Design a protein around this motif. Structure first.
Motif, PDB file in Angstrom:
ATOM      1  N   UNK C 106       8.830   5.199  73.352  1.00 53.86           N
ATOM      2  CA  UNK C 106       8.231   3.985  72.799  1.00 53.86           C
ATOM      3  C   UNK C 106       6.960   4.273  71.994  1.00 53.86           C
ATOM      4  N   UNK C 107       6.549   5.544  71.994  1.00 58.17           N
ATOM      5  CA  UNK C 107       5.441   6.045  71.178  1.00 58.17           C
ATOM      6  C   UNK C 107       5.765   5.921  69.693  1.00 58.17           C
ATOM      7  N   UNK C 108       4.728   5.785  68.865  1.00 55.40           N
ATOM      8  CA  UNK C 108       4.884   5.776  67.404  1.00 55.40           C
ATOM      9  C   UNK C 108       5.456   7.092  66.888  1.00 55.40           C
ATOM     10  N   UNK C 109       5.291   8.155  67.673  1.00 58.44           N
ATOM     11  CA  UNK C 109       6.044   9.410  67.510  1.00 58.44           C
ATOM     12  C   UNK C 109       7.594   9.250  67.471  1.00 58.44           C
ATOM     13  N   UNK C 110       8.103   8.972  68.669  1.00 58.13           N
ATOM     14  CA  UNK C 110       9.539   8.919  68.917  1.00 58.13           C
ATOM     15  C   UNK C 110      10.178   7.860  68.058  1.00 58.13           C
ATOM     16  N   UNK C 111       9.520   6.694  67.962  1.00 58.25           N
ATOM     17  CA  UNK C 111      10.014   5.577  67.160  1.00 58.25           C
ATOM     18  C   UNK C 111      10.193   6.005  65.713  1.00 58.25           C
ATOM     19  N   UNK C 112       9.189   6.719  65.200  1.00 56.70           N
ATOM     20  CA  UNK C 112       9.206   7.215  63.825  1.00 56.70           C
ATOM     21  C   UNK C 112      10.425   8.103  63.591  1.00 56.70           C
ATOM     22  N   UNK C 113      10.632   8.998  64.547  1.00 52.21           N
ATOM     23  CA  UNK C 113      11.759   9.941  64.517  1.00 52.21           C
ATOM     24  C   UNK C 113      13.084   9.188  64.458  1.00 52.21           C
ATOM     25  N   UNK C 114      13.215   8.193  65.339  1.00 51.02           N
ATOM     26  CA  UNK C 114      14.471   7.471  65.588  1.00 51.02           C
ATOM     27  C   UNK C 114      14.856   6.425  64.534  1.00 51.02           C
ATOM     28  N   UNK C 115      13.995   6.231  63.535  1.00 45.49           N
ATOM     29  CA  UNK C 115      14.252   5.287  62.439  1.00 45.49           C
ATOM     30  C   UNK C 115      14.546   5.983  61.102  1.00 45.49           C
ATOM     31  N   UNK C 116      14.721   7.303  61.155  1.00 47.15           N
ATOM     32  CA  UNK C 116      14.790   8.145  59.963  1.00 47.15           C
ATOM     33  C   UNK C 116      13.428   8.770  59.752  1.00 47.15           C
ATOM     34  N   UNK C 117      12.963   8.768  58.500  1.00 47.49           N
ATOM     35  CA  UNK C 117      11.580   9.137  58.112  1.00 47.49           C
ATOM     36  C   UNK C 117      11.060  10.527  58.537  1.00 47.49           C
ATOM     37  N   UNK C 118      11.807  11.234  59.387  1.00 44.73           N
ATOM     38  CA  UNK C 118      11.291  12.422  60.071  1.00 44.73           C
ATOM     39  C   UNK C 118      12.079  13.723  59.852  1.00 44.73           C
ATOM     40  N   UNK C 119      13.235  13.851  60.516  1.00 51.64           N
ATOM     41  CA  UNK C 119      13.923  15.139  60.778  1.00 51.64           C
ATOM     42  C   UNK C 119      13.129  15.907  61.841  1.00 51.64           C
ATOM     43  N   UNK C 120      13.467  15.639  63.105  1.00 51.61           N
ATOM     44  CA  UNK C 120      12.767  16.129  64.315  1.00 51.61           C
ATOM     45  C   UNK C 120      11.406  15.459  64.596  1.00 51.61           C
ATOM     46  N   UNK C 121      10.987  15.559  65.857  1.00 47.79           N
ATOM     47  CA  UNK C 121       9.840  14.884  66.431  1.00 47.79           C
ATOM     48  C   UNK C 121       8.539  15.490  65.926  1.00 47.79           C
ATOM     49  N   UNK C 122       8.520  16.819  65.806  1.00 47.61           N
ATOM     50  CA  UNK C 122       7.345  17.550  65.356  1.00 47.61           C
ATOM     51  C   UNK C 122       6.923  17.075  63.968  1.00 47.61           C
ATOM     52  N   UNK C 123       7.923  16.944  63.097  1.00 51.21           N
ATOM     53  CA  UNK C 123       7.713  16.492  61.718  1.00 51.21           C
ATOM     54  C   UNK C 123       7.060  15.114  61.711  1.00 51.21           C
ATOM     55  N   UNK C 124       7.617  14.244  62.546  1.00 47.68           N
ATOM     56  CA  UNK C 124       7.141  12.864  62.693  1.00 47.68           C
ATOM     57  C   UNK C 124       5.675  12.857  63.105  1.00 47.68           C
ATOM     58  N   UNK C 125       5.380  13.693  64.092  1.00 51.59           N
ATOM     59  CA  UNK C 125       4.027  13.844  64.640  1.00 51.59           C
ATOM     60  C   UNK C 125       3.057  14.240  63.532  1.00 51.59           C
TER      61      UNK C 125
END
Ligand SMILES: [Mg+2]
Ligand SMILES: [Mg+2]
Ligand SMILES: [Mg+2]
Ligand SMILES: [Mg+2]
Ligand SMILES: [Mg+2]
Ligand SMILES: [Mg+2]
Ligand SMILES: [Mg+2]
Ligand SMILES: [Mg+2]
Ligand SMILES: [Mg+2]
Ligand SMILES: [Mg+2]
Ligand SMILES: [Mg+2]
Ligand SMILES: [Mg+2]
Ligand SMILES: [Mg+2]
Ligand SMILES: [Mg+2]
Ligand SMILES: [Mg+2]
Ligand SMILES: [Mg+2]
Ligand SMILES: [Mg+2]
Ligand SMILES: [Mg+2]
Ligand SMILES: [Mg+2]
Ligand SMILES: [Mg+2]
Ligand SMILES: [Mg+2]
Ligand SMILES: [Mg+2]
Ligand SMILES: [Mg+2]
Ligand SMILES: [Mg+2]
Ligand SMILES: [Mg+2]
Ligand SMILES: [Mg+2]
Ligand SMILES: [Mg+2]
Ligand SMILES: [Mg+2]
Ligand SMILES: [Mg+2]
Ligand SMILES: [Mg+2]
Ligand SMILES: [Mg+2]
Ligand SMILES: [Mg+2]
Ligand SMILES: [Mg+2]
Lengths: 188, 260, 125, 155
Positions: C106-125
């Motif tokens: 539910x973190x802005x991390x994981x959420x970011x990852x799970x909506x596209x925008x990222x490619x992995x969690x680290x990238x999102x972070x």
RNA sequence: GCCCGUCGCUAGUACCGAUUGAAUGGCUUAGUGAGGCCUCAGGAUUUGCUUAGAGAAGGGGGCAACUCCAUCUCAGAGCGAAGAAUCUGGUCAAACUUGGUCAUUUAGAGGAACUAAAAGUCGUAACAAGGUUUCCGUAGGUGAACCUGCGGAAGGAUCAUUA
RNA sequence: ACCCACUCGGCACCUUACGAGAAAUCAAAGUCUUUGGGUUCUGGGGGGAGUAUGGUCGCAAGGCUGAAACUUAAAGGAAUU
RNA sequence: CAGGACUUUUACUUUGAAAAAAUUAGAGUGUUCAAAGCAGGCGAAAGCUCGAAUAUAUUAGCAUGGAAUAAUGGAAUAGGAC
RNA sequence: CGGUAAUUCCAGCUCCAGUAGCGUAUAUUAAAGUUGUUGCAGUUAAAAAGCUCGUAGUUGAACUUUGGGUCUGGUUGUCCGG
RNA sequence: UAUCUGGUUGAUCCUGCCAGUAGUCAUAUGCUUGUCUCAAAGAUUAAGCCAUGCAUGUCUAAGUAUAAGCAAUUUAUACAGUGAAACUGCGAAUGGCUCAUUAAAUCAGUUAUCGUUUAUUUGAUAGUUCCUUUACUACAUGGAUAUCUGUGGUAAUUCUAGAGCUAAUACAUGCUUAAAAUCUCGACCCUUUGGAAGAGAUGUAUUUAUUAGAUAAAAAAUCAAUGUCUUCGGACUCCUUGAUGAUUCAUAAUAACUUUUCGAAUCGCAUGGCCUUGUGCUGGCGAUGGUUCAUUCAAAUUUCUGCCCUAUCAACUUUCGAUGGUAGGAUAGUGGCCUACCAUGGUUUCAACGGGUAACGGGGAAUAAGGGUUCGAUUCCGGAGAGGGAGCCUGAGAAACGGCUACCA
């Protein structure tokens, strides 16, 4: 100075208390006035919240009440004869409250004369009428009458002369007077 | 320690000032006045922290100086003047008139009022005595002494002071089944009816009070301020008519009356 | 003499330092959600614990009792808002069953990852 | 307490500002002033009819009963005109969920309107400080006779 | 195998203690006692009221008690009022001289300990029936464990001898 | 006086524990994590030490009361081969 | 109601009133999050508007409901009750 | 652990833990049911006074209005969503 | 958010500790240390000592300017714009710091002041100061003293002498003022049903008396005083009184007293209304003051209950007040608070008293199943103290120390 604190005292148990706080100005108490007889001298003292008490060191006159008749007259105080607290005071001639003193009585006598006309020891028409209307009311306690003959009445001071400067009281009457007389006799 | 205290620390302030914990070390200490320190409300607080007409103390002072605020007709210039319960604060510009009344919760509410009511002040009776030259005087629990009162005005009775001159126009006798306002304790700000008056001749009379919703409570006699005959108060009461809701109820109200 | 500022320690360390299984679990969690520290995990745990404390207390009080009805309800609402509890489980009894994963998902991390925008969690972070 | 005589010491003892006009002779001959303390308490007939004096009596004197009204058993009568009252109570120790039996002696003033023995239960009212330790004044003595009616066993 | 005490050695703790030892503080006997406050006086000086006689050039609106003015103004003197130094008794009472006392410290000639290190010396007390069964109370004796009386206890080497 | 049967009170004992307990063992050492019938006293690792000191009681021997510094990872209990 | 007239006295428990604010528990509220703070929010974005809750603290005193539990008291020279 | 293969010393390399922090010292709380009211022990591990009397303290058998009936307010489950 | 694990043995089960583990608005310290927000910080030892600078001063239209200050210019021939100084007023008793003392003391909650003081505040509030009433300061009284100008003293200090002027809301004095009603005194007449011409006193505050400050209900007879209307038999009628649980309360009244308190000789801006046409009589909004009563900010005390270890403290207090009484003194007032006379009490195994505290009390803090344990010098509330002990001045308030006086260091 003399302090009225209960700090310096022992407790109910008899325990000696420890010295907490140095004595305060609201705890303070001043020296005894112990007033004498002759030539009016009154020193004012500044109390708490402004205000003056009047130390009456040397007083001569005083206005005393004859409670039976309902009159008071300014008169000379001549000697303290008995004081309930201390014989030392009497010896000194220290005028205080509840002290028993001798009054000049002449003014009282004059007043009596004016009122009834009977005199103690042995004119207009309105005055005569007034007298007539009164009378039999003029009898008095025998002791008082006797005292009058001598010229000096026994009176008790009821003012606190060290507090007001004013020295005032009531002429001795009834049972109380008798008691005082008895006490005096015992003393002699 | 040595004479009177002259400052007030911000935390030591009355809580119903609604003063914020920060933005200062000190609170505006109410000057010697008509109302009790804890039961008062300083003019500064009223000006800055309620109506928001001033931003800071200087501003408040400035406002005061031009002779515009009026507590009970009379002018006032003290920033720390202690206007309390029932006091009428009139501002000449704006033409707004205020009466300092409590609310359902406890604090002083901003209660806007018309000029027809602002003319008079309502006041409880603290003392009835004969003064010098045998002249009877009444003492209001809100500051005043009024000479030659109507001789069936007793203690705890409330009085309509016409304020412009300071004479008693009318009064309410303290009795069972009469509209009452609570001015102290937890029940402060509540409106009720007086069901019963317990005595305990020795220490503190307790009065039983029912509100409009049939909801009884008990307070001490010196916390209870008569206001009229039930349903018909002599003043206008603030919004929520001194009623006290439960928390859940309040929440529900907040929810159901949403209009953003 | 100005009014004191309130601090609060927002995390709690484990009561036993080298519980190996626990450590491994923590590591796994970190890997899953790109967590910089064990500290983050601890914080989450602490938060969970606070909630649990509240819930348990509420439960201890009688049901339909005012306080429970209010505070518990509020808590539930908050949880739903945050998105940790599901609409099926507005219950207060379900609040105890939450577990650390639901907060991390539910973190802005994981959420970011799970909506596209990222490619992995680290990238999102 | 008093115990006999009345006019017994260095000063004449009279109620202040009470006047007994020695011209028009009255029924009582000397006027006695009294007041009821209030709080539901009753001024005894021993106080009204009596010849005793006391400034520190709550009925015939100058002290006024206000504040706390306590009760307890009498421990000592020995010192003149006053009393000692024991006041047993239970102090709750919270750790052990239990109670200590406790004590506290209250010295109190006894109006000569009362007969007080050791062991009598006494209702005592708070007033203005009277001496170093005394703040209280005896209002009601509850143990009236004990067994003064039938003391002897023979029917 | 285990193991006890004396006497040794090296450290380290605490204990007693001659020193008429020392130090600090708290009370305190006797005697002194600053300073204020109160009080008995004292009265430098400071002024006011007396009509107390002026020289004054209208010393109140024209020679004259000025058609005399808080008039020119000092000898007056009497009567006050204010009052500093100083001073008699108190009172609160810091402190100081010599003692005594309690508390805590502190030098400390010497003495008697215990612990630690356990390749010193003399035995072998205990653990096996430990080679005299151990303990215990107590008393005496010893180089040291210890030994020996008198009473007790198996935690003893005996739950045992009917009739 | 025996004999039998029952019964209160006592000194014990025998067998089982379904209960206890570390076990030896225990009809209490049972009715204790399913924890509360009422009460008094005593202990809180081993040494230092029943010593030092201060009381107090003894004619004396002694008794009752009773430390700390420091020291130490064990001293102990019941059972085992 | 407003006045007597005296009421066996407690312990216990009840609801109430008081146990300053901060702290604590806790409602609300995107300080960008959070520790926090008591703010803010909505418009025509001409002015309008929620707020700033509640809950705890049991020792002692005060108030009232209860009458189990535990104690105390009354008529035995009856000088007892009507 | 170290007396010649030291996974324990000193380093090198790898690795683990916590991480802008982590270590050491001395208190103190939890762990401690190793202070015990909840809640400990006392035959042998520390510990039952040599024994009895005994004031304070703590504690102390049972017993006084129980049972029925008659209406009458609520408050949630139900019986349908009327 | 109820957890344990290593160590007594050849092995075992225990008792038990030691060791680990976790936290600490708990201190120190060792290494490191980029950013954001928040921010403790000479408490612990020595309430040890202190260089130097600062921390309490203050003026408005509205107490007092002849600065020989500045203005300077289209209110001054009394002043009138600003305005240093100084007098006066007010404040300096708050704040800030610290925790040495202190163990029924402080403190907390709770009472009480019918037991008192209270600048300020906000309400109140004072025709009566006069003293015989045919010619009197009230259209306004007196003497000072500061700054200033000059003459100095001293090595020196926020040391002040001498002279010369000069102010007040400073310091002193001291006028108006009615009407009525009530209480002290009677020039006479006319023999009662008696009844009066006219003269003095009365504010408040102060002092001691004394009186009133009522109230459970109705109906009499008459004896001593003996009123009023008599429609001359006799009627008699409508006859005051606040509050509290409670007072000798509030308050009123008679008696007098008093080295007789107060009752405006004060300021700023307004310049309005009637003509008896004076410069007359008037009148608005305010400042300061001042009396008692309020109230408010406070204040002293005060009730009940509650503090940490210790019996290797069991008796303590009482000549020198201990507990109580009486009277006085003193105090703002209560009280052995102190003094005189008297009595012998008061506290205690339900720990008095003594000792210790590396003790300020509380709100609270750390820990965290439940119960507890430890800490709280420290931001808020009380309380103490300004090197130590005393003692006081000024004031509404101080036994003050950024006041003074002394002693000790
Ligand atoms: Mg005054
Ligand atoms: Mg009252
Ligand atoms: Mg002297
Ligand atoms: Mg051998
Ligand atoms: Mg042998
Ligand atoms: Mg053994
Ligand atoms: Mg030991
Ligand atoms: Mg063995
Ligand atoms: Mg919170
Ligand atoms: Mg190697
Ligand atoms: Mg612990
Ligand atoms: Mg144990
Ligand atoms: Mg043993
Ligand atoms: Mg029973
Ligand atoms: Mg536990
Ligand atoms: Mg072993
Ligand atoms: Mg081994
Ligand atoms: Mg440990
Ligand atoms: Mg940046
Ligand atoms: Mg320091
Ligand atoms: Mg000045
Ligand atoms: Mg201060
Ligand atoms: Mg009277
Ligand atoms: Mg009076
Ligand atoms: Mg007295
Ligand atoms: Mg200390
Ligand atoms: Mg403490
Ligand atoms: Mg503190
Ligand atoms: Mg300290
Ligand atoms: Mg210093
Ligand atoms: Mg000082
Ligand atoms: Mg200083
Ligand atoms: Mg200061």
């Amino acid at each position: 100075g003399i302090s009225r604190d209960s700090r310096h005292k022992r407790a109910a148990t008899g325990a000696k208390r420890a010295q907490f706080r140095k004595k305060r100005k609201f705890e303070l108490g001043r020296q005894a006035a112990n007033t004498k007889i002759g030539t009016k001298r009154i020193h004012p003292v500044r109390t708490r919240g402004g205000n003056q008490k009047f130390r009456a060191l040397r007083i001569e006159t005083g206005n005393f009440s004859w409670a039976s008749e309902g009159v008071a007259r300014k008169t000379r105080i001549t000697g303290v004869v008995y004081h309930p607290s201390n014989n030392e005071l009497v010896r000194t001639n220290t005028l205080t409250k509840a002290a028993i003193v001798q009054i000049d009585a002449t003014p009282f006598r004059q007043w009596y004369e004016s009122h009834y006309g009977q005199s103690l020891g042995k004119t207009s028409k309105n005055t005569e009428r007034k007298w007539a209307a009164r009378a039999a009311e003029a009898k008095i306690e025998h002791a008082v009458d006797s005292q009058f003959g001598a010229g000096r009445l026994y009176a008790a001071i009821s003012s606190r002369p060290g507090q007001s400067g004013r020295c005032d009281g009531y002429i001795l009457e009834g049972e109380e007077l008798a008691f005082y007389l008895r006490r005096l006799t015992a003393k002699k | 320690a040595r004479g009177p205290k002259k400052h007030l620390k911000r935390l030591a302030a009355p809580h119903h000032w609604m003063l914020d914990k920060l933005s200062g070390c000190y609170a505006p200490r109410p000057s010697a006045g008509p109302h009790k320190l804890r039961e008062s409300l300083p003019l500064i607080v009223f000006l800055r922290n309620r109506l928001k007409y001033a931003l800071n103390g200087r501003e408040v002072k400035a406002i005061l100086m031009q002779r515009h605020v009026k507590v009970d007709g009379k002018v006032r210039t003290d920033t720390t003047f202690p206007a309390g319960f029932m006091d009428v604060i009139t501002l000449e510009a704006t033409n707004e008139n205020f009466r300092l009344v409590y609310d359902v919760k406890g604090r002083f509410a901003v209660h806007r009022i018309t000029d027809e009511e602002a003319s008079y002040k309502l006041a409880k009776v603290k003392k009835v005595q004969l003064g010098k030259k045998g002249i009877p005087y009444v003492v209001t629990h809100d500051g005043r002494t009024i000479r030659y009162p109507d001789p069936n005005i007793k203690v705890n009775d409330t009085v309509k002071v016409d304020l412009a001159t300071g004479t008693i126009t009318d009064f309410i006798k303290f009795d069972t089944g009469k509209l009452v306002y609570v001015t102290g304790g937890r029940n402060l700000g509540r409106v009720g009816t007086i069901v019963h008056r317990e005595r305990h001749e020795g220490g503190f009379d307790l009065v039983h009070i029912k509100d409009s919703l049939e909801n009884t409570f008990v307070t001490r006699l010196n916390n209870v301020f008569v206001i009229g005959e039930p349903g018909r108060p002599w003043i206008s009461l603030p919004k929520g008519k001194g009623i006290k809701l439960t928390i859940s109820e309040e929440r529900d109200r907040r929810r159901a009356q949403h209009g953003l | 003499p100005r009014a004191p500022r309130t601090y609060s320690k927002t995390y709690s360390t484990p009561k036993r330092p080298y519980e190996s299984a626990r450590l491994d679990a923590e590591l796994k969690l970190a890997g899953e959600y790109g967590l910089k520290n064990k500290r983050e995990i601890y914080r989450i745990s602490f938060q969970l614990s606070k909630i649990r404390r509240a819930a348990r207390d509420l439960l201890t009080r009688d049901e339909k009792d005012p306080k429970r009805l209010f505070e518990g309800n509020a808590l539930i609402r908050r949880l739903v808002r945050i998105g940790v509890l599901s609409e099926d489980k507005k219950k207060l009894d379900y609040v105890l069953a939450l577990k650390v994963e639901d907060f991390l998902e539910r973190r802005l991390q994981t959420q970011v990852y799970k909506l596209g925008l990222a490619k992995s969690v680290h990238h999102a972070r | 307490s008093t115990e006999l005589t009345v006019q017994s010491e260095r000063a004449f003892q009279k109620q202040p500002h009470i006047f007994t006009n020695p011209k028009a002779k009255a029924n009582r001959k000397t006027k006695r002033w009294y007041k009821n303390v209030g709080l539901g308490f009753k001024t005894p007939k021993t106080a009204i009819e009596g010849s005793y004096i006391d400034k520190k009596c709550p009925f015939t004197g100058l002290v006024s009963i206000r504040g706390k009204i306590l009760t307890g058993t009498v421990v000592s009568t020995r010192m003149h005109r006053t009393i000692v009252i024991r006041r047993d109570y239970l102090h709750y120790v919270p750790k052990y969920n239990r109670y200590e039996k406790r004590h506290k002696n209250v010295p109190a003033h006894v109006s000569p309107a009362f007969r007080v023995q050791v062991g009598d239960i006494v209702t005592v009212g708070q007033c203005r400080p009277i001496s170093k330790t005394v703040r209280f004044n005896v209002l009601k003595v509850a143990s009236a006779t004990g067994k003064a009616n039938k003391q002897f066993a023979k029917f």
